[PDB]
Amino acid sequence: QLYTLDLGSLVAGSRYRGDFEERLKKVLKEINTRGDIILFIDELHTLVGAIDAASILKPKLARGELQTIGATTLDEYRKYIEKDAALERRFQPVQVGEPTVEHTIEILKGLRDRYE
Amino acid sequence: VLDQFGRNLTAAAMEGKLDPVIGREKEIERVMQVLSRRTKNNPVLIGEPGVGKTAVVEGLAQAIVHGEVPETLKDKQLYTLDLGSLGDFEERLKKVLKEINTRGDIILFIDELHTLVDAASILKPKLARGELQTIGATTLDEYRKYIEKDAALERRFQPVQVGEPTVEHTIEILKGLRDRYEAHHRVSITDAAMVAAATLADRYINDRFLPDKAIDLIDEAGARMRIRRMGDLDVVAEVDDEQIAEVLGNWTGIPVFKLTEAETTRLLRMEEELHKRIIGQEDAVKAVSKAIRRTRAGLKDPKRPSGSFIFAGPSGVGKTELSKALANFLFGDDDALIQIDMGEFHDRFTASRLQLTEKVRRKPFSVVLFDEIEKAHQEIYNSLLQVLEDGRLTDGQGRTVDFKNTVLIFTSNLGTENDYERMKQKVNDELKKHFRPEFLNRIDDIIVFHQLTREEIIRMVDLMISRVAGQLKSKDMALVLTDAAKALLAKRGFDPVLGARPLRRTIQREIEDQLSEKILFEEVGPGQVVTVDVDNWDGEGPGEDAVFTFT
Amino acid sequence: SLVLDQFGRNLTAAAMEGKLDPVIGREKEIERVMQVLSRRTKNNPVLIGEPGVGKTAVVEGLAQAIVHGEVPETLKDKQLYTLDLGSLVAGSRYRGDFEERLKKVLKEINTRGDIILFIDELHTLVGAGAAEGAIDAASILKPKLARGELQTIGATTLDEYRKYIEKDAALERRFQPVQVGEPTVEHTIEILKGLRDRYEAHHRVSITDAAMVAAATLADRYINDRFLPDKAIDLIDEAGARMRIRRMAEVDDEQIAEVLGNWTGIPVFKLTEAETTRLLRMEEELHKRIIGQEDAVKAVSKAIRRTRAGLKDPKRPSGSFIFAGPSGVGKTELSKALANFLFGDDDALIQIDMGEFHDRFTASRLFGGQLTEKVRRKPFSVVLFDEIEKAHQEIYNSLLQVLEDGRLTDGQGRTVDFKNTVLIFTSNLGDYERMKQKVNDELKKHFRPEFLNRIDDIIVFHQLTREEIIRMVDLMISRVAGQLKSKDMALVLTDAAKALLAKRGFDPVLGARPLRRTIQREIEDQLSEKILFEEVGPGQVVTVDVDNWDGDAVFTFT
């Protein structure tokens, strides 16, 4: 199961001091307990900032119990993410390019049914 | 408490978890030099990311455990300090530093020392007291940015450089880590695969650096082999040049046919791949072909640029388009051709800028063009002499720009078969008097272009009118040009002084404009081929009495 | 107290413990520091000196004097605390972290009443905190510095003092300058003799007197990027560390020579001070790369011996020689060989040709410059001046005064010294005795004869004889083979092929410059196209031969 992570859901309602930490640790425990969940954290650049939301994930990502997929703009990657020692060593930039014009034609042909 | 707030490297070596290091003997002995001093005894490792800065520390830990260190470094435990485990922050950091000082035999590895320069309020005085012995790891720009301008640290931190590993060193590193990767992926990797992976990581990849740049390809090929491989079947797997080529094709978006094959054959089918784009200049084509064959093949001095060409001929008559053709073959992109014109650089303030350094650093495997070198500044001349002589560029930033893989073409309008023999004679004469002999003495070759003839100018006309032919096919129309109109349009556009550039104006005025009015007139509009023709003309006159006709 | 510890180190308590290195010969500066520190109002001294002269050493010696008790009553039992601005500037990502930390430090100082600040890098006081207009460290220290209640000791660099402190007159009138100049050779020897005890205790090695003497006398004249005695101490300390890793002994001239050779790349036997014996064998060290010109080699060798002996007046440049003769004789490579012998580096020579720099605007580039910056980076450099015939009168006058006083006053406002610079004027203007009289009358009518008076030697090169051209062909084929031996290609050059190489290479009207072009065209290009088209491959010898002339010619790569 591939789950995308909503940080707003984590941080909403976390009025008490340790509620965010408890929520993130419970999420990580559930992920490592089920053993078949992949994480997709869209906008990986805003992970810093809930102690932070990202600072909880640094010990886990260093030890390899957590596997995540990020998504970032070219400019934001060179400014927010790589400026760390436990992340630049553990994240692999997979470049996704702008589709070619003929590839865009095929993409539009594949989306014809839903718009029609 | 140190294990709860950091990771021990010396204790990890008995477990053997740490990867072996290969070929870092000189940097490790330099690190023991710096660590075995009394002033400036803390080394900082300087190098690009993904070069092996932490590998030097790992090798130091392995050598400490193996017992190849002086008495000062005997039984010294290296501890990588991670900030993730660390009011409470300052006291826990002070407690762990106090425990380090109480032990007295702990050496801290603090990677990315820019994180200090919000712990700077704690570690900076402690290292001032000399009770903390630390190995730092930063890059060159950061070291020249933060540490070098911080006067309080040159008394306590000494730089040691971790340079880029060579190709053979990268191959040896891959051979060393073969056992680890064969164990992890349960795949078998051959030596030719690692040699190919190192070479292609050096050649087609820019954004990373060796040996991370090739170990990534090796790991990616192992992952692909495990994906494509996974009743019972035997374990018969062999990562070879094919898997590495496919992985790099998926990486950099290069098509799978002939991406990595005989570069000799690639250089030898030069002529027809120019001939689909270049017009005429067959002598110039074969001259530049044989020059790039005899210069790029490693027969020239390896500490020099791959080639240096002089393009003699009128401006825009075929030299520049041939440069784009060479860029599209060797390096694959027109934008890979960095466009530098000496007409824009006519003063010292602009000459000192040599928007050229970051462009050639964007792609080291890119062609460098210098247009109209006659009016370049003298500082430009001296920089060109330096670059051609030592094979390097020393920019104002202060980095050695790699120029093995850049090829230089000097595009100029100087001097513009017996007539062409006299042409070449006076071109080299004017390069002996208007220019100076040593600059040409450090030029690989000079080629002088020829004036384009009748069938050459017709083959220019038909290809460039094919642009509006395609634009007209886009409107369910077709365009036909007769030979009489071709010859008359060539005669109208015949200007050997200015070249074929006024032919653009003649095309744009006579053909596209009248056709654009005519399609709006809606008589030779959609649903009919239009065939241009010329009336009131014999085939020899200048064309003042001749009129274009549309059917 | 408890808050100064996280920002600084107690120098007085550390000197009481016995951690501080002793200072040699800084009695005057430390006395001046007590003089300024004893004042009632504005008792703040700032130590101005180049980086690496010992300003922090002066402050530490002051702490050593305070703890023992050789100070007046106004400096007795005063805890000297160092303070760094970087531990306060960093972490100021909010509105008032910097002001809070600095106010806490000042409050602790005022409550203690016996704290003197050694704030290093004083020039960052204006730039710390906010900008220079808003509230910064200067704005919070100035109301208290002027009344002499906050005793502080600053340290800075001369140019940074003139550019940062002197612009702010209110801050400039609050700090008394104390000049700490760069020590000489003998003071550096005394410093090394003082610190030998600490370094031999730390390194477990015995340092001889020749060791410190060699360290100082090599660091002072070879390293110019820093200032003494930081460089000599660095040499001794690095040599001790090298010995300590090699043992798993004693430090002498060999250790210092090898560590400085590692630092600079110059070979070790050069750095050994066998200058006379090196001067004894330089005839073959110069002839090992040059061909013929035996009279020229002898003349330049006796010139080098007469100049480097030190018997002349030490108000002149080391040497100044004119090189006359036709081009292609090898004057440039001779200058390069001289640079290689005298200093050990091929880049130690500067190649400047003024034929492209004619007007005064280009003379501003010349001096006022890359020449000035390179002779400031290293004053022991051979300069090469090509084509002095077409010179402008301003260039003439500047050359006159430069060679006159051994000194150049550039447009940068600096007096750059030329006392050991070797000037080589490779002039193409104008049997051996006859060439003297021909140029003697001709330079005095083209230049002034004060040129010929002030110059040292005129060395005239004759044309290269055919067998010398043959040996030059051998030398160039040697490096061609050196760069192509990677592919196991063996070249044999027959006598007829050598004659063709000589005749297509030697242009008597133009000299022996065009060899480098032709040897790449007539040999390297043909060999390249023969390897590419697979007529010959690796591991086969090619004995190249030629037809059509034995004493239109085609080269056969047999």
Ligand SMILES: Nc1ncnc2c1ncn2[C@@H]1O[C@H](COP(=O)(O)OP(=O)(O)O)[C@@H](O)[C@H]1O
């Ligand atoms: N000489 C070597 N021998 C073996 N492995 C090496 C060597 N140099 C680098 N490596 C490997 O290359 C990888 C790249 O490390 P790097 O990215 O330079 O570390 P950092 O991110 O701290 O700069 C390391 O994991 C290391 O194992």
Ligand SMILES: Nc1ncnc2c1ncn2[C@@H]1O[C@H](COP(=O)(O)OP(=O)(O)O)[C@@H](O)[C@H]1O
């Ligand atoms: N008189 C001296 N006695 C002993 N050591 C000295 C003396 N003068 C300078 N030094 C040494 O020179 C080095 C640089 O001095 P310091 O003032 O700490 O830094 P800088 O001079 O660069 O400001 C110090 O390590 C110090 O030991």
